[PDB]
A paper describes a structure:
One of these epitopes, is the V3-glycan supersite, an oligomannose patch around the V3 base of Env and the potential N-linked glycosylation site at position 332 of the Env gp120 subunit. bNAbs to this site are among the most potent anti HIV-1 antibodies isolated to date and have considerable breadth, moreover, they are among the most frequently elicited upon natural infection with HIV-1 in humans. Here, we report on the cloning and molecular characterization of a V3-glycan bNAb produced in this elite neutralizing non-human primate, its structure bound to an HIV-1 Env trimer, and the implications for development of vaccines targeting the V3-glycan patch. We conclude that Ab1485 is a potent neutralizer with limited breadth compared to some of the human bNAbs reported to date.
The structure of the Ab1485-Env complex revealed recognition of an epitope focused on the N332gp120 glycan, the gp120 GDIR peptide motif, and V1 loop. In common with human-derived V3/N332gp120 glycan-targeting bNAbs, Ab1485’s primary interaction was with the N332gp120 glycan (Man6GlcNAc2), which interfaces almost entirely with the CDRH3 loop (~400 Å2 antibody buried surface area (BSA)). When compared to the poses of human-derived bNAbs and V3-targeting antibodies elicited in rabbits or rhesus macaques by vaccination or SHIVBG505 challenge, Ab1485 adopts a Env-binding orientation in a manner most closely related to PGT128, which primarily uses its heavy chain to interact with the V3/N332gp120-glycan epitope. Closer examination of the Ab1485 epitope revealed that all three heavy chain CDR loops contact the 324GDIR327 gp120 peptide motif at the base of the V3-loop, which contrasts interactions by both heavy and light chain CDR loops observed in 10–1074/PGT121-like and BG18 bNAbs. The primary molecular contacts are with CDRH1 residues R30HC, S31HC, and N32HC, which form potential hydrogen bonds with backbone and sidechain atoms from residues G324gp120 and D325gp120.
Residue numbers in the entry:
A (entry chain P): 1 to 30, 30A, 31 to 106
B (entry chain B), F (entry chain C): 519 to 546, 569 to 663
C (entry chain G), E (entry chain E): 34 to 57, 65 to 78, 82 to 135, 152 to 185, 188 to 309, 312 to 321, 321A, 322 to 397, ...
D (entry chain O): 1 to 35, 35A, 36 to 52, 54 to 77, 77A, 77B, 77C, 77D, ...
């Protein structure tokens, strides 16, 4: 079973800033089998990056992630004010696919 | 005998015994030019794979050893759980991201071996 | 560990490509220019997702059938002179006598001729006064004297480097995993039969009757059925016409009807009555699985529309019948004899729901008999008020993809990828 | 389009059983999709319960024996539907329950690692509270 | 010393091959059939001898434009019935209101109809009696209902084993060595715009206005001119005419003009007076280098003659304007305000200087507005006494190889030869 | 020098020295598609011959030796009256019943040699 210690536990920045979020596995995922969500308060999470760096339809190209070894990182470009909330890195490398812990992005 | 694609679900180890089976089945008015454009594709598609083997030096061979060392960052499973638990359809996703750079190290690992065997003959 | 390259591995990816014939007096579907025919392997451990409504073998078969139709219409006669004014008197309201003035082989003289037209081809403009039905917004090109229409089995063989996967599950409703597939060089024989409301000569389901549709909960989508035992049908045209050859130019000839020989008796196609009630009873049993065990299945007759689609039209012997199936679809269901169907003939055809391109079929001298099969229907549901226990299934059809989509519901074309790299403990010295 | 609608709020007492159902409007059929049931403890990391895939349901390593994932396919009256019961309910099992589906048509998708899946169409959330 | 064979070496030879499209409602230049498009390498220490007047990429592009034209004109209507005799009366002498007999959908009746013709389509037979202009030398075919004429960028891509060499200089006059060639998989986007006396929507020079000609000392060769800044032109059409539909047979429809809504006001084109007075000054600077530092450069109005060559014919919005351009080329040169040009529309078109094939463009409902770039000219020089200090440049044009040869002056197609033998100190054991 | 098919009547021993003559002469509107389908048939016939030599391990060679032993149930003449009293046109009738058998013992005697050679590299 894989466990991820997502970091930083919580960051804050205003619009117009570039934001990076880290996520580390326990073993190495050599197929880039991770995904990233976004949970506004109360609503349901929305998948927006699968298999390392692929972008679902409809998600604006402002988002971007990277994948290498055991360090997986997500980057947001020229942040916009409706994009505050929470994020999650999930592995689906081996059964069962656990989640991260969550790192809010407050204003 | 199992036939064309018969070993599609077998393990990677017992499905490497039937390479010749698929290797000989890859080459061969309304119907007058549906026919003609269907053959000029089966040939041009095939010649773009026999050239790739020639670049790497494996021409005319189904199994061909090379010199590139398997980087442990492409797939770090051990040999007992690659040739005995997987099927080619499963193994061909796991390296889907690293197939365009294995093809780049195989190509110029041969170009260094061309100009090393050429010098050696000069002595 | 050192990389090792294997050539000829069993991997495939979805693809779409161009397929061609193979098929063992000229036919329209020119079996004289298709390759002659010639092999089915079993794929174990294998599970392959299917989908028969996002198939692509269908949209290629619908275009090949159309484009074979109207290349065999180009090279021969074009009857644009026949748009003139007719003076038509009754032959006895079904046949007319219709004499008119039409040209000769000498460009300045005229000719007075006559011919017998069915009443389904003339619309009057207000003896009496008439004109042909497809004269505004169509151009009639006579059918052509030495080409046949009878279907001939054609096999759709895929090119080299591609393969066709066949689902051998015997209860396959065309969507979902198929845990037993195969690999075929090319399909069984698909007869390109044209029909409506009743699929003729077909191919039978193995175990039970199967109901197939795109979106069941939607009432705007047709519902293909597939019987598992045939229900043969018997058609006839008793009268025995005579052929006469008008000449309308240098090198043209118009094959018009001469005289009837005998009394006029209507043309029909019967049924066996008791067989049609068993078959309609196995349909209801299998149609309750999708709608409810306590629902009243009421069958009705054609709703209405264009005569090509509210009646069971087909083509056998060379003369295009148009039967009236109202006595077949009756009989609400709750939890020696023969049905006689009155069929009317036409002679000017608009087959593929095209606009502005028609055809005239020369008469068939002789008596027409016909022995077919009925191996499917094309129903359609009437949208109620979601608070009843009654469902009404009128026959529909018209759209032509639905005939063939009932034969290519199990095939899938794939693309091989024969190159692979794997780690090993060998090294090239 | 695809739209997911789960049942409403409910409250129970320990030692009972409660069921939540999920009706998906726009699914072709559950042959070509897969259903995964997850859970979000109040303000916590998500958690995965079980699934149905190619019509063979299974449960996690901490829930086996106390759960039942079942589903029924299309019907002329109702869309495809899936259901979840929690047996021997306890004060620990209060959380929000989500209904998730992923396509499984294309073998080269990338949203599923030969059974283990990522979730791309989420429900709306059902809140289950147990107390006395 | 022993021979050694090298495969894949950089050698090339000139060649002539068959390029094809690549391009990213049906069009004429059928961008629905050309390969979808997708890359430039700098070659150092390489010098190549170009020549833009023995370029073969032009005599190909001229045949594909002509052959794509009447491929998209074959399938649809042929208006031979309209050569009849007309009785025409003035609408107010620019529009005629002509009425004639004509066949019906029914081959024996007749039909008295009418339509609004221009004056440029009818030549009279001696309310008088007229007839269509192309009626003794041409077979007119109606333009075709659902096909556009707007130009789309098309790339000319070379087959595999050839390559295209491009000169990245900025002052290239189309002849002589270019010390910086590149290699491109295929060309930039070339718009197939048709026009005379003024190149439109062209490609702009990078530094200065450039003068190019076959043989400057010969007054029977055109003198292409390329600007380095756009000069935009507008060319509206005020009226709002409506469409009608005659019927001339089974399934054929003639789209004649109905009524004119409003007043008949002339069409025009505006080009700014300051912009054209400053872009015609840079021409003279660049045109004294080839004729002398003390010569008098004089401009005149074209010649008179055939109406396709004495006018700025172009095709925007859908109608074929034929402007005048006599207020642009004016007074001689020695060492918020606009110019308005009157234009006349036609509807029967003989494009490629052919004889025997015409075309009829159906009207355009609605108002027509336009914007373009004047980024070229095609001048010619008068036969003078070769003794005086006056040179008079009248716009010429007409021939169509001189529009594309303004785009394809920097390219060249070569042929890779990859086999080579050379001596070395090795030997095969 | 005798040319193309110049040696068709000479004994098999003396007509085997001239294989490079036939090997390099087997590749290269009403007249506009009679030409086009006469050029896609010469290519596809050639490419199904070079694939055979690849499967059997004789790629790029004209006179190639193999491992398959000559079974005596195919032709039990001695060499002095094969290569000295026959022309290839006579020797092709005789084994014409046993030619799809030899093509199957040569095709798999190579696949057992690909894997013998891969093991030898492991040590
Ligand atoms: C096109 O054609 C295809 C081809 O068939 C059609 O596919 C068919 O689709 C139907 C759906 O309509 C499928 O039936 C459904 O199957 C699911 C799967 O159930 C699985 O899990 C059950 C629970 O598993 C637990 O326990 C097992 C025990 O070993 C453990 O191993 C697991 O880990 C779990 O912990 C399990 O019981 C099932 O086994 C069943 O089948 C086997 C063999 O078939 C039998 O031996 C068993 O006795 C058992 O019956 C299976 O493993 C079921 O979930 C569905 O059950 C619902 O429907 C029943 C009848 O309709 C109903 O009686 C049930 O109560 C249940 O109803 C559910 O919903 C109700 C309302 O929401 C609730 O009130 C109720 O409580 C329940 O929640 C159903 O049986 C077919 O399997 C499938 N066929 C194939 C070959 O795959 C397809 O439908 C067609 N397409 C279209 C569009 O029509
Ligand atoms: C096969 O055929 C059936 C029958 O048409 C199709 O079923 C329809 O599917 C559409 C999909 O869009 C459904 O439309 C959506 O329904 C959602 C659920 O609403 C239903 O349930 C709630 C609660 O029970 C009821 O209050 C409501 O009246 C409906 O009965 C709606 O939530 C959706 O609305 C959303 O979008 C709109 C517009 O953006 C917003 O304004 C809303 O706030 C909301 O966000 C939407 O209306 C439709 O209801 C279904 N009809 C049925 C079941 O009869 C299948 O989709 C079809 N199969 C296919 C296409 O594959
Ligand atoms: C060019 O000259 C021709 C004749 O040389 C001329 O054609 C004339 O057009 C008018 C239309 O304005 C025709 O008048 C029509 O006649 C019919 C039959 O009597 C009437 O039914 C018409 O009624 C109109 O008004 C109705 C009330 O709103 C409408 O409902 C109806 O649709 C009609 O619009 C109308 O009176 C006239 O008959 C012809 N001439 C001949 C000889 O037939 C044409 O107008 C001239 N063109 C121009 C641009 O001047
Ligand atoms: C470009 O056009 C000019 C004319 O404007 C061409 O120049 C002309 O060339 C001809 C020969 O081809 C000259 O005639 C020759 O004259 C010599 C002596 O002068 C005589 O010995 C020959 O018998 C012949 O008559 C002609 O004079 C000359 N024109 C002028 C005005 O000098 C030129 O050839 C053209 N360019 C090309 C590439 O053809
Ligand atoms: C890992 O690869 C996937 C998919 O790889 C694609 O197919 C391979 C054969 C190879 O050719 C790759 O170069 C291809 O990109 C990547 O996911 C894709 O991401 C792009 C980005 O927009 C998206 O358009 C595609 O749809 C995705 N693939 C699929 C199948 O949907 C993924 O980005 C790679 N992981 C990395 C780069 O970390
Ligand atoms: C020719 O046959 C037609 C059709 O049978 C006759 O038309 C009918 O005439 C009767 C007499 O009034 C009407 O009641 C019917 O309504 C007519 N039928 C239709 C469909 O309108 C016709 O009378 C016969 N004779 C002639 C000279 O036409
Ligand atoms: C349809 O017509 C066929 C004739 O082709 C009928 O077949 C005959 O059926 C009788 C009844 O037993 C047999 O005695 C005959 O031998 C059959 N004909 C032949 C050629 O064998 C059939 O009965 C008809 N069916 C219906 C429903 O009308
Ligand atoms: C097709 O056949 C049906 C069945 O007979 C005809 O419709 C019935 O005709 C009878 C005789 O006049 C009427 O009493 C019924 O009311 C009709 N409708 C039924 C039974 O639903 C029909 O006229 C025939 N032709 C067409 C074009 O439908
Ligand atoms: C209607 O379907 C029946 C199937 O019951 C056909 O009868 C069989 O057709 C196959 C096809 O070659 C023959 O091999 C069988 O001998 C036929 N008889 C039986 C009892 O299976 C029948 O031919 C079909 N109708 C027509 C007109 O062909
Ligand atoms: C199918 O899978 C079983 C194990 O589940 C395996 O023993 C068998 O060999 C497989 N089929 C083939 C053809 O190898
Ligand atoms: C293996 O892959 C890693 C990935 O970054 C790379 O840094 C390294 O150079 C590669 N080669 C070796 C020998 O580690
Ligand atoms: C190879 O890896 C698997 C996965 O952990 C393990 O079960 C197996 O023992 C390993 N092989 C050896 C020789 O340790
Ligand atoms: C044929 O022509 C004659 C005279 O030319 C005419 O009287 C007669 O009405 C015409 N026939 C028809 C059917 O109109
Ligand atoms: C053609 O004639 C028929 C017969 O009267 C008429 O119903 C129809 O409206 C006419 N026009 C078209 C376009 O079919
Ligand atoms: C169908 O039934 C209706 C019932 O009123 C009847 O009027 C009609 O003639 C029948 N046939 C058709 C084709 O509508
Ligand atoms: C259809 O059913 C009705 C209702 O019993 C019956 O009266 C009628 O005779 C049946 N047949 C036809 C052809 O309408
Ligand atoms: C009907 O026409 C056919 C034509 O071949 C002929 O054989 C037969 O004798 C005719 N029947 C009668 C009763 O004239
Ligand atoms: C029609 O216009 C012509 C050309 O301007 C003119 O000569 C003639 O007099 C005009 N006739 C009438 C009746 O206006
Ligand atoms: C139209 O036909 C009538 C019939 O005689 C004729 O008088 C008139 O001149 C014709 N119109 C033309 C333009 O010829
Ligand atoms: C041409 O039209 C454009 C677009 O409105 C306008 O900006 C420009 O001033 C016009 N030029 C002239 C010379 O009228
Ligand atoms: C050009 O100018 C001359 C003299 O002013 C004049 O005769 C002629 O009509 C003008 N236009 C053309 C096109 O020649
Ligand atoms: C001009 O034509 C257009 C297009 O038909 C229309 O929208 C507009 O109203 C017309 N203007 C007038 C004044 O009729
Ligand atoms: C004229 O050229 C400029 C150069 O960039 C271009 O932007 C403009 O679009 C052109 N004119 C028109 C009407 O497109
Ligand atoms: C033909 O046969 C003779 C004797 O049979 C032999 O000498 C000669 O070499 C043969 N021809 C050739 C071309 O070898
Ligand atoms: C040669 O082939 C025959 C088959 O006809 C076989 O019986 C025999 O054993 C083979 N020879 C040897 C030595 O195996
Ligand atoms: C081969 O056998 C034949 C039998 O006809 C004999 O004449 C000849 O000498 C033999 N050759 C050898 C080399 O044994």
């Amino acid at each position: 079973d894989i466990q991820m210690t997502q970091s930083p536990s919580t960051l804050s920045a205003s619009t117009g800033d570039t934001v990076r979020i880290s996520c580390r596995a326990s073993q190495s995922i050599t197929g880039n089998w991770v995904a990233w969500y976004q949970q506004r308060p109360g609503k349901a999470p929305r998948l927006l990056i699968y298999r390392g760096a692929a972008l679902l339809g409809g998600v604006p190209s402002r988002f971007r992630g990277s994948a290498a070894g055991t360090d997986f990182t997500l980057t947001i470009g020229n942040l916009q004010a409706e994009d505050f909330g929470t994020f999650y890195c999930q592995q689906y490398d081996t059964y069962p696919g656990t989640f991260g812990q969550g790192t809010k992005v407050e204003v | 005998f199992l036939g064309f694609l018969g070993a599609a679900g077998s393990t990677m180890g017992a499905a490497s015994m039937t390479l010749t089976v698929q290797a000989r089945n890859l080459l061969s008015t309304v119907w007058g030019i549906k026919q003609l454009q269907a053959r000029v594709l089966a040939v041009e598609r095939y010649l773009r794979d026999q050239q790739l083997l020639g670049i790497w030096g494996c021409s005319g061979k189904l199994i061909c050893c090379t010199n590139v060392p398997w980087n442990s960052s492409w797939s770090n499973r051990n040999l007992s759980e690659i040739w005995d638990n997987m099927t080619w359809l499963q193994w061909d996703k796991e390296i889907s991201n690293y197939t365009q750079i294995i093809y780049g190290l195989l190509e110029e690992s041969q170009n260094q071996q061309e100009k090393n065997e050429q010098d050696l003959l000069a002595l | 560990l050192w990389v090792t390259v294997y050539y000829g591995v069993p991997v495939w990816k979805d693809a779409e490509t161009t397929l061609f014939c193979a098929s063992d007096k000229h036919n329209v579907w020119a079996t004289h220019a298709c390759v002659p025919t010639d092999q089915e392997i079993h794929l174990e451990n294998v599970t392959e997702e299917f989908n028969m409504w996002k198939n692509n073998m269908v949209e290629q078969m619908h275009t090949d059938i159309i484009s074979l139709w109207d290349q065999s219409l180009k090279p021969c006669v074009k009857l644009t002179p026949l748009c003139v004014t007719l003076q038509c008197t009754n032959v006895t309201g079904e046949l007319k006598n219709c004499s008119f003035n039409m040209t000769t082989e000498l460009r300045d003289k005229k000719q007075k001729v006559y011919s017998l037209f069915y009443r389904l081809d003339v619309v009057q403009i207000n003896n009496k006064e008439y004109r042909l039905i497809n004269c505004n917004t169509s151009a009639i090109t006579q059918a052509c004297p030495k080409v046949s229409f009878e279907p001939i089995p054609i096999h759709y063989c895929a090119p080299a480097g591609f393969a066709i996967l066949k689902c051998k599950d015997k209860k396959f409703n065309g969507t979902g995993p198929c845990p037993s597939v195969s690999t075929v060089q090319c399909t069984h024989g698909i007869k390109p039969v044209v029909s409506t409301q009743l699929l003729l000569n077909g191919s039978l389901a193995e175990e039970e009757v199967m109901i197939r549709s795109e979106n069941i909960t939607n009432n705007a989508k047709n519902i293909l059925v597939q019987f598992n035992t045939p229900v043969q049908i018997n058609c006839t045209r008793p009268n025995n016409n005579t052929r006469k050859s008008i000449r309308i130019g240098p090198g043209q000839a118009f094959y018009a009807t001469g005289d009837i020989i005998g009394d006029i008796r209507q043309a029909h196609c019967n049924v066996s009555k008791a067989t049609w009630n068993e078959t309609l009873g196995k349909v209801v049993k299998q149609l309750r699985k999708h709608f409810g065990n306590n629902t009243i299945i009421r069958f009705a007759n054609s709703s209405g529309g264009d005569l090509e689609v509210t009646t069971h039209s087909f083509n056998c012997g060379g003369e295009f019948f148009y039967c009236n199936t109202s006595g077949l679809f009756n009989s609400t269901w709750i939890s020696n004899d023969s049905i006689t169907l009155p069929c009317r003939i036409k002679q000017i055809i608009n087959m593929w729901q095209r606009i502005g391109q028609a055809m005239y079929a020369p008469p068939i001298q002789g008596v027409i008999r016909c022995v077919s099969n009925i191996t499917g229907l094309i129903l359609t549901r009437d949208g109620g008020s979601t608070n009843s226990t009654t469902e009404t299934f009128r026959p529909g059809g018209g759209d032509m993809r639905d005939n063939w989509r009932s034969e290519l519901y199990k095939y899938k074309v794939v693309k091989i990828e024969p190159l692979g790299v794997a780690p090993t403990r060998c090294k090239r010295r | 389009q695809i739209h997911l609608v789960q049942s409403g709020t409910e409250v129970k007492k320990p030692g009972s059983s409660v069921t939540v159902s999920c009706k998906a409007y726009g699914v072709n059929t559950f042959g070509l999709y897969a259903v995964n049931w997850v859970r979000q403890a109040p303000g916590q990391s998500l958690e995965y319960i079980g699934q149905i895939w190619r019509w063979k349901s299974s449960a996690s390593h901490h829930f086996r024996g106390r759960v039942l994932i079942s589903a029924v396919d299309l019907t002329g009256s109702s869309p495809p539907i899936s259901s979840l019961e929690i047996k021997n309910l306890t004060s620990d099992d209060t959380a929000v329950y989500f209904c998730t589906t992923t396509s499984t048509y294309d073998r080269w998708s990338g949203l599923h690692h030969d059974g283990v899946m990522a979730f791309s169409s989420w429900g709306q959330g059902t809140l289950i509270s147990v107390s006395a």
